[PDB]
């Protein structure tokens, strides 16, 4: 019954364009009766570093630290840091995970990258036995809501930065799809700083308009063809 | 003449394959008479998060905080956090910058992504205009030395992960080249964890061997065709 939604927000300013898109997602999804949880990473001062402090108690090898094996063991032994576990709890219960963030070097901001590095550990998000279409998070929907600095023009197959689908690869396919996520079509708000009040008001409008039928949307075919192909 | 190289290291275990590759570069370049410097991010507990704490002076817009704008203005006014300016000092005098890290979700670890987000600020690494071939860091060489869990086979066009050059796009083009860096062919040491004891020694030997003639190398054609083809 009903749907649960987690929004991983990554911006320092509540009055930013990102903040508005995030508030619009909450308003709409909340008006729809959906269950909404938000992770304000900056506000939570979320630990981005993948260290040995992510494992509580004794390590399975205090001689040579291997973050990948340690977390897998910590997860299976329920001994991960509480901040990491608190997040996995939200992801486990979610039906739709929305990532709201400004583009930082063709990728997500470091605080957001830390999230994925620490929260999506082996055993919870994936495992040798099953990744991609066999990820441990299959059945869940993922969506990237990103804002850029460069104009949509610059993000064309013949533009300077190249086609936006290029930088989406490491995120949609390499991460989301890898964990079994049904990646939805990204929502990109091109150069909101450059745009005007009219244009900006219009961007946030399309965001909310789309949020009315996201449960109706079809998962994007996360393939090498979709991103780079033609 | 002499040369200065900066290795931005990002691994927690000094005994890891990455740590070995890092000590190797340090030994080889150093043997050649080169000026080397290592930025062991984890050992420095490097701040990955981009926040208002990176600016010391008065904020241009104390009402709405904008990291990009604030760090640009702070850089010109010399009001950036010392940990940030200390890194820019290293990059500035560097002829070659090598990034030593294990692949994390088709990208760099959060701690290393934070370095790119905070260190390569507007005014220092690039300007608008003044990016890509016009980058402020033009005349410098940059190299990505990545180690992964996946195998070379998995990282092929028809592989489960796609060609390894795909995930190198945001980093080589979107980041380094954007900053004016001449990108040298990446050094990828595939699945050293699965490789045999001899194959591991083989991957290390190939590293130090390539470094012996690194200065005679030429940058790759950092273009969409080089990465994807088409
Ligand atoms: C370290 C770093 C790396 C970066 N890397 C890249 C990169 O690789 N590629 C790239 O393209 N860009 C990059 N950028 C730029 C970045 O993507 C943009 O600055 C950012 O996405 C702008 O979004 P914002 O939310 O910060 O904008 P804002 O600063 O919020 O500006 C947008 C405008 O929206 C207005 N606004 C707020 N709420 C509303 C509302 N409800 N209705 C109408 N208007 C509203 C604001 O007041 C403001 O004037 C980078 C920036 C930094 C700091
Ligand atoms: C959060 C997270 C996300 C990840 N995402 C991805 C991803 O998207 N794609 C992907 O492919 N992988 C991914 N990985 C896996 C990661 O890239 C590999 O685990 C890592 O690159 C292995 O390098 P290492 O230095 O950590 O190995 P090590 O743990 O050091 O193991 C390699 C072996 O090398 C041996 N060794 C070290 N030095 C020497 C030497 N001098 N001579 C001989 N043998 C030596 C070691 O003792 C060890 O047995 C991820 C891992 C984590 C933790
Ligand atoms: C801060 N800012 C404004 C925006 O124009 C922009 C584009 C980039 O590619 C980048 O690295 C930084 C940017
Ligand atoms: C630790 N490990 C094993 C290696 O096979 C691997 C590939 C990934 O894509 C990933 O996220 C984690 C991995
Ligand atoms: Zn995919
Ligand atoms: Zn390029």
Residue whose token pair is 């989301």: A176
Pick from B165, B8, B30, B174: nearest CA to B99: B8
Pick from A140, A137, A143, A141: nearest CA to A101: A143
Contact B111 A167 (CB under 8 A): no
Experimental method: X-ray
Expressed as residue numbers, the domain containing B42 is: 1-230
Classify residue B186 by its DSSP letter: P
Count of positions (residues) in chain B: 230
C-alpha to C-alpha distance for A3 and B118, rounded to whole angstroms: 38
CA angle in degrees (0–180, nearest 5) for A120-A220-B223: 80
Using a 6 Å CB cutoff, which residues line ligand 3?
A 149-150; B 68, 122, 128
Contact B49 A111 (CB under 8 A): yes
C-alpha to C-alpha distance for B98 and B114, rounded to whole angstroms: 16
Q: Which two tokens stand for residue B33?
A: 């008479």
Instruction: Nearest by CB to A224, from B13, B63, B162: name it.
Output: B162
Instruction: Nearest by CB to B170, from A106, A118, A178: name it.
Output: A106
Write the DSSP assignment of B3-41 as a string of letters. -EEEEEE--S-TTSHHHHHHHHHHHHHHHHT-EEEEEEH
Q: How far is A174 from chain B (nearest CA, A)?
A: 6
Tally of domains in chain B:
1
C-alpha to C-alpha distance for A20 and B10, rounded to whole angstroms: 35
Residue B89: phi, psi to the nearest 5? -65, -45
Query: Omega before A79 cis (within 30°)?
Result: no
Mutate to test the interface with A, among B49, B70, B178 (most CBs of A within 10 A): B49
CB-count burial class (<10 Å; 0-12, 13-18, 19+) for A51: middle
Write the DSSP assignment of B134-169 as a string of letters. G-TTTT-EEEEEEE-SS-TTTTSTTSSS--HHHHTI
C-alpha to C-alpha distance for B138 and B91, rounded to whole angstroms: 12
Pick from B116, B22, B178: nearest CA to A154: B178
Contact B50 A170 (CB under 8 A): no
Q: Which two tokens stand for residue A154?
A: 């610059």
Q: What is the enclosing helix (H) or strand (E) of B73? A: helix B67-77
Contact A50 B104 (CB under 8 A): yes
Ligand 2 proximity of B147 Cβ (cutoff 6 Å): yes
Classify residue B195 by its DSSP letter: S
Q: State the CATH number of the domain containing residue B198.
A: 3.40.50.360
Ligand 2 proximity of B71 Cβ (cutoff 6 Å): no
Say which residues have a Cβ less than 8 Å from residue B110's Cβ, sequence separation at least 6: A48, A49, A50, A110, A111, A113, A114, A117, A118, B48, B104
C-alpha to C-alpha distance for A60 and A77, rounded to whole angstroms: 11
The dihedral sign for the CA sequence B67, A51, A6, B175:
positive
CB-count burial class (<10 Å; 0-12, 13-18, 19+) for B193: middle
Write the DSSP assignment of chain A as a string of letters. ---EEEEEE--S-TTSHHHHHHHHHHHHHHHTT-EEEEEEHHHHT------GGGB-S--S-TTS--HHHHHHHHHHTT-B-HHHHHHHHHHHH-SEEEEEEE-BTTB--HHHHHHHHHHS-BTTTBBTTB-GGG-TTTT-EEEEEEE-SS-GGGGSTTSSS--THHHHHHHIIIIIGGGT-EEPPPEEE--TTTS-HHHHHHHHHHHHHHTTSTTTPPPP--SHHHHT--
Q: Which two tokens stand for residue A124?
A: 């919870």
């Amino acid at each position: 019954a009903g749907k649960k939604v987690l929004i991983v927000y990554a911006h320092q300013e509540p009055k930013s364009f990102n903040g508005s898109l995030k508030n619009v997602a909450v308003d709409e999804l909340s008006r729809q009766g959906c269950t909404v949880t938000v992770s304000d990473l900056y506000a939570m001062n979320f630990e981005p570093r993948a260290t040995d402090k992510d494992i509580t108690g004794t390590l399975s090898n205090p001689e040579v630290f291997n973050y990948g094996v340690e977390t897998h063991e910590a997860y299976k032994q329920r001994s991960l840091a509480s901040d990491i576990t608190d997040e996995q709890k939200k992801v486990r219960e979610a039906d739709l995970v929305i990532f709201q963030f400004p583009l930082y070097w063709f990728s997500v901001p470091a605080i957001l990258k830390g999230w994925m590095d620490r929260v999506l550990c082996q055993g919870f998000a994936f495992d040798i036995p099953g990744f991609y279409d066999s990820g441990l998070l299959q059945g869940k929907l993922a969506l990237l809501s990103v804002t850029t600095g460069g104009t949509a023009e610059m993000y064309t197959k013949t533009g300077v930065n190249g086609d936006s689908r290029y930088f989406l690869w490491p995120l949609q396919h390499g991460t989301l799809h890898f964990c079994g996520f049904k990646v939805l079509a990204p929502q990109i708000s091109f150069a909101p700083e450059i745009a005007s009040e009219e244009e900006r008001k219009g961007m946030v409008a399309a965001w909310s308009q789309r949020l009315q039928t996201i449960w109706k949307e079809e998962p994007i075919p996360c393939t090498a063809h979709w991103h780079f192909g033609q």
